[PDB]
Amino acid sequence: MCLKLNLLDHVFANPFMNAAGVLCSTEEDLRCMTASSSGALVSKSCTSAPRDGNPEPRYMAFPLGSINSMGLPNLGFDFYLKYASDLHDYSKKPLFLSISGLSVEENVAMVRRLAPVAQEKGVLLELNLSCPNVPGKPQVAYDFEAMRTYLQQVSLAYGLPFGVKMPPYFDIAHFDTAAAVLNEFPLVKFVTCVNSVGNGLVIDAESESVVIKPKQGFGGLGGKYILPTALANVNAFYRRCPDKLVFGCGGVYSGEDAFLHILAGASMVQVGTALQEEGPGIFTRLEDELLEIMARKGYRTLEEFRGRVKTIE
Amino acid sequence: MCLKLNLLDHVFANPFMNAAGVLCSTEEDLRCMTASSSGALVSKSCTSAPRDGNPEPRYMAFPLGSINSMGLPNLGFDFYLKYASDLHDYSKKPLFLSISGLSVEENVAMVRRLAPVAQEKGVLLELNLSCPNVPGKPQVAYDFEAMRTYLQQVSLAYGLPFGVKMPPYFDIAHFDTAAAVLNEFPLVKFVTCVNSVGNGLVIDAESESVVIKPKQGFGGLGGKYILPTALANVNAFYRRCPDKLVFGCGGVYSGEDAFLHILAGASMVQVGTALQEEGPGIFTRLEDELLEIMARKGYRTLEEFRGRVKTIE
Numbered sequence A, B: 001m002c003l004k005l006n007l008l009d010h011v012f013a014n015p016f017m018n019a020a021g022v023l024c025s026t027e028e029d030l031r032c033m034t035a036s037s038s039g040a041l042v043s044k045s046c047t048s049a050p051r052d053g054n055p056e057p058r059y060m061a062f063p064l065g066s067i068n069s070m071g072l073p074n075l076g077f078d079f080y081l082k083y084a085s086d087l088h089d090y091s092k093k094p095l096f097l098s099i100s101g102l103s104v105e106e107n108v109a110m111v112r113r114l115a116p117v118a119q120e121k122g123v124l125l126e127l128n129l130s131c132p133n134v135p136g137k138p139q140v141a142y143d144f145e146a147m148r149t150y151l152q153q154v155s156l157a158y159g160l161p162f163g164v165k166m167p168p169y170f171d172i173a174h175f176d177t178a179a180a181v182l183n184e185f186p187l188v189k190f191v192t193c194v195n196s197v198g199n200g201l202v203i204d205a206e207s208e209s210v211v212i213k214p215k216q217g218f219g220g221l222g223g224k225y226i227l228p229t230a231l232a233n234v235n236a237f238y239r240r241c242p243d244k245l246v247f248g249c250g251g252v253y254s255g256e257d258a259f260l261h262i263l264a265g266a267s268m269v270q271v272g273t274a275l276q277e278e279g280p281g282i283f284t285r286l287e288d289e290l291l292e293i294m295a296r297k298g299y300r301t302l303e304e305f306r307g308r309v310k311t312i313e
């Protein structure tokens, strides 16, 4: 028994991959993720031009999770495109590429150049809608006319199957509205729920100080704090987007957490904070633990329980 | 060394109170909160007409917190008004009365009848703005026109100092926009941040089932899950509303959690899930733990460190 699956016309040894942001910035990172047992990998979200990011300290982890405000440091799209084009060993696993340009025009310019490599090599695109934080107006995904524009312009410019990375929502009317926008677009084949829970604040009681330097300590929350939130989002989109895959992300520390995501409807399961904390070895443990839970229950396939979460009465 | 505070023309032995909806539904509950060593109490959020609430089960708790979809079960306005006018013992501690009407008109009717008791007995109003409005629209506080509408109408109808209970926000733009709207209304002397994190989803691995019955398991999150969220909101509003008080609510299980909320800017500190789980003896523990932290650090009062979270550079 084993966890292989097939999606978006690619083979995956299992449904586990890193979350965009974590261990995927450098060639070293990417080679390492590739050498791992992950079923797949995603590159750091990129911009046209290299960026240094925000002032350190900008990431911190705690027993219950993480807080970050990295500010989108990355080597520039020319680096990840070249990794996608000449360095990645596709015989090992599929590769997803994340773009998070700061304007629709920035993203349109990137995807046009990515399209041919997608054709030739099979790299897959994840569009980060979560995204920066627009200065007088909210992030793209919390402003649905903006979201509809980006998706229009991008599907025109790329013209292949792609996916989008969503921030969490917290209201039924926004699920309905967001999901309706997404279903306007047939090329969006997958939705990744969720990005970090935006603008938390961790304060350390001993020094009476915030723990990260940018934005007066305010940052995105990962890890055990957001699992119930990530599961609501996965399952809300699972239910509202029947002709799309849902990739779940958020708070996976065990095979159990992974098992819950899948039951909520996840086809792939992404690991962020726990991978940052534990390192790539976590893939062999999560596999094992997930295979153990399946074995105890009599499940031979992920298809047997994907999306089959039970409701009461 | 003491936890005493004077605000809104009332005296409070300590900053601790129950969160609205927890241990405040019945006369039995309210008498219990009053016999506790809480600095104050707040009554369950009421509607005009008594309500049964949603079907059971509807609340559940776990090591890291809770989920609920209670559906506003309460005894009705007349019961809590009568509690405020005839049964409550204001010489023990102050009372807050929470109103969460299902339309602007229902809130207006209640507050008009509350006014004279507010004046004669000194009961204090907390308007729950995290109420649903018309379905298919976001809750009131996520819809800034509805929020504005509700505040002008209740301000005109009530004519007295009241406060407002806010849900969490996750985007700077919303912080700015919600605080700008709040600052239009001089009678809003206080802001409670935050209500439950909306529509999380808790799934039980052994049963493969959601754990609450209403809404396909989707519910409001409290507890350890939401501390950082809650401090972010406390502190955003403490910085954005210099002429109003902030009450903090969110994942307080200890004096250190209360300490943190207070450094973020909290004047009062409410306890929800921890109180539901532990019962009202929790208040003596919280007070001793908080005083223990203050001694160790040299602080003799709360205003010595309220709002005094340090940033880096």
Ligand SMILES: Cc1cc2nc3c(=O)[nH]c(=O)nc-3n(C[C@H](O)[C@H](O)[C@H](O)COP(=O)(O)O)c2cc1C
Binding pocket: A019, A020, A021, A022, A044, A045, A059, A066, A067, A068, A070, A072, A098, A100, A128, A130, A165, A194, A195, A196, A221, A222, A223, A224, A226, A249, A250, A251, A252, A270, A271, A272, A273, A274, A276
């Ligand atoms: C240090 C760090 C960097 C991240 N960078 C990105 C990024 O570039 N693009 C992106 O879409 N998400 C990014 N994320 C968000 C993660 O992809 C993930 O959505 C989030 O951490 C929640 O999952 P977790 O609970 O498993 O950590 C980052 C998260 C962290 C902690």
Ligand SMILES: Cc1cc2nc3c(=O)[nH]c(=O)nc-3n(C[C@H](O)[C@H](O)[C@H](O)COP(=O)(O)O)c2cc1C
Binding pocket: B019, B020, B021, B022, B044, B045, B059, B066, B067, B068, B070, B072, B098, B100, B128, B130, B165, B194, B195, B196, B221, B222, B223, B224, B226, B249, B250, B251, B252, B270, B271, B272, B273, B274
């Ligand atoms: C069972 C239950 C009932 C609640 N009822 C109300 C309510 O009637 N009105 C309200 O404003 N908030 C209500 N809340 C939210 C709490 O007042 C509080 O804001 C939230 O639980 C966060 O506090 P905690 O993290 O201490 O649980 C309720 C929470 C729970 C768990």
Ligand SMILES: COC(=O)c1ccc2cc(CCc3c(C(=O)O)[nH]c(=O)[nH]c3=O)ccc2c1
Binding pocket: A021, A045, A054, A068, A069, A070, A071, A072, A073, A100, A128, A130, A131, A132, A133, A195, A196, A214, A215, A220, A221
């Ligand atoms: C005010 O600080 C900024 O300039 C800033 C802050 C956060 C940003 C966040 C992003 C999105 C990339 C990202 C990040 C990140 O790189 O900071 N962290 C996350 O948890 N999720 C993400 O998707 C892009 C630009 C940003 C710029």
Ligand SMILES: COC(=O)c1ccc2cc(CCc3c(C(=O)O)[nH]c(=O)[nH]c3=O)ccc2c1
Binding pocket: B021, B045, B054, B068, B069, B070, B071, B072, B073, B100, B128, B130, B131, B132, B195, B196, B214, B215, B220
């Ligand atoms: C579940 O669908 C419903 O019919 C319904 C009706 C009224 C509601 C009213 C509220 C607001 C009162 C409230 C509740 C509550 O009573 O459910 N729970 C919270 O955690 N915070 C709250 O502020 C929340 C959900 C509701 C759901």
